[PDB]
């Protein structure tokens, strides 16, 4: 309960846009899987040169985030996979033109939280996502069916 109020206060303090608050609620330490209606709303938003900046800028903050929040990074890679299959061509051109932050995530590693090694979830997503960006012929096939 305390986190749900305190995050709502940090949203007011930083001044966040309704587009940022959506993307931010989608990618949040919260252990719940990112919901299908959230993913398809961010894909639907992508067809707007005013919102596409705010979506990709918040996902680029969350892909950067500290090791304490592997939960952010895992969802952010999930949202990027959905956005390249479903979303506008701008999502793919952006993600191809700064691939290096996704490809660099592929070695990520948080450990001794309770004893386990916690990076593998990030490393599998980043590996298959970087493979999917590199497989331009698989990606343009996937996009052309789903759009």
């Amino acid at each position: 309960m305390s986190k749900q109020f305190v995050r709502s206060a940090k949203n007011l303090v930083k001044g966040y846009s309704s587009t940022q608050v959506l993307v931010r609620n989608a990618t949040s330490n919260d252990n719940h899987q990112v919901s299908k209606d959230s993913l398809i709303e961010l894909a639907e938003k992508s067809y707007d040169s005013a919102d596409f900046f705010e979506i990709m800028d918040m996902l680029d903050k969350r892909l950067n985030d500290k090791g304490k929040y592997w939960r952010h990074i895992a969802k952010a890679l999930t949202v990027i996979d959905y956005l390249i299959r479903f979303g506008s061509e701008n999502c793919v051109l952006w993600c191809r033109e700064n691939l290096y932050i996704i490809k660099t995530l592929k070695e990520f590693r948080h450990e001794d939280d309770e004893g386990i090694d916690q990076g593998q979830i990030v490393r599998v997503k980043a590996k298959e996502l970087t493979a999917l960006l590199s497989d331009d012929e698989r990606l343009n096939e996937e996009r052309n069916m789903n759009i």
Binding site: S49, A50, M56, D57, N90, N98
Partner: protein
Amino acid sequence: MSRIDSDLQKALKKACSVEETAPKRKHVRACIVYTWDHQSSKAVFTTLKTLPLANDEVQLFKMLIVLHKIIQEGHPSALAEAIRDRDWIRSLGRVHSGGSSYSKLIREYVRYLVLKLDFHAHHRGFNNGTFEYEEYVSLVSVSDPDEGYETILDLMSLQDSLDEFSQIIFASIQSERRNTECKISALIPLIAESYGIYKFITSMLRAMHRQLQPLKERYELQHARLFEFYADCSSVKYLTTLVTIPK
């Protein structure tokens, strides 16, 4: 687009803010300080080309104030990219066709910027946004004094258009009577250039006068317009506050 451009794009939304208040110095500074950091300015023009720019005339005049301050204040690359893309700037002069009063302010500003950028490309071996007394360009000009006369008379032709445009802004201010804030903000970079161009003609004229007549009579008319323009600015109850004298 790339992640470093995203840092600049946040500032450009806020500097071209949705209505006819001033473009904040804090967001114009964030673009200028970026332009020095990344040594180059292709990202700032590529952002203005891809912005929701021509959506309404209030934001397009704000964008021309911001774009003038970025060319004037910023790294020599901001002007060098403006010398390449003066035809994109010219296209902005068309996109609202001079109808309602606010559109006329846009068209006279585009004509002023296209004249400034034409003059840097055509005439001078000088590439700073504000003019300043470059010793090598001044020495090479006085060493070539028939082109030296053409340099002060062409630089005076910019100060003439600077002065004519200032009267368009003053008449448009006075006829509208209220909501002056963006129009007076457009006077701020024109004030700094008016002093910068004045200091350059004064320093070039002094050099050419001692290195060797009628340019002193032309200089007295331009000086009279300079002192008239700063008296006209002294009337303006917000604009006067921030500049630490319109010099």
